[PDB]
Amino acid sequence: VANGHLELIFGWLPLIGELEGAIEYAELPDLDFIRCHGLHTLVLQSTPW
Amino acid sequence: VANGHLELIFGWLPLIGELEGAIEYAELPDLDFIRCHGLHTLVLQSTPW
């Protein structure tokens, strides 16, 4: 049983490395930019014709 | 007695012939063969879906 379990652990080892490498892919500081806009008006004067 | 025992042993002689023949028959070198099998396995991995 010991020889069968040690072999399985050894075979597991590389997948753990791949998963760890994938973990580092999540902490990459990358993003974009957000924008907004605002307007307002004020009627001044008016007259008929 | 000297003649009777001689006749008796001469009559016993032939039986020793077939007895030695059977003894030789018991030494005949013969035999058959034996053959077997076997199998060991090991799981690799698994994931959900």
Side-chain angles (χ1 to χ4, degrees):
Chain A
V1 171
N3 269 314
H5 291 190
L6 175 51
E7 203 293 296
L8 289 169
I9 296 300
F10 268 118
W12 294 140
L13 194 132
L15 179 59
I16 312 315
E18 197 276 325
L19 288 167
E20 198 277 331
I23 283 278
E24 307 308 313
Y25 202 93
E27 286 187 355
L28 267 76
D30 299 327
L31 212 59
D32 209 7
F33 39 80
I34 190 60
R35 314 192 58 208
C36 61
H37 82 279
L39 57 94
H40 189 74
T41 65
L42 176 138
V43 63
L44 175 46
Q45 289 293 113
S46 168
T47 182
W49 178 58
Chain B
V1 170
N3 279 82
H5 289 194
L6 188 52
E7 293 285 327
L8 289 159
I9 191 73
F10 271 125
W12 300 136
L13 193 140
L15 194 77
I16 309 313
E18 77 92 21
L19 288 172
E20 195 273 331
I23 291 285
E24 177 59 26
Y25 177 70
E27 183 44 36
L28 292 175
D30 60 345
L31 249 55
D32 311 331
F33 49 97
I34 197 64
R35 59 197 208 214
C36 55
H37 62 298
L39 56 105
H40 185 64
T41 91
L42 185 64
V43 180
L44 268 292
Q45 80 197 330
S46 156
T47 60
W49 167 46

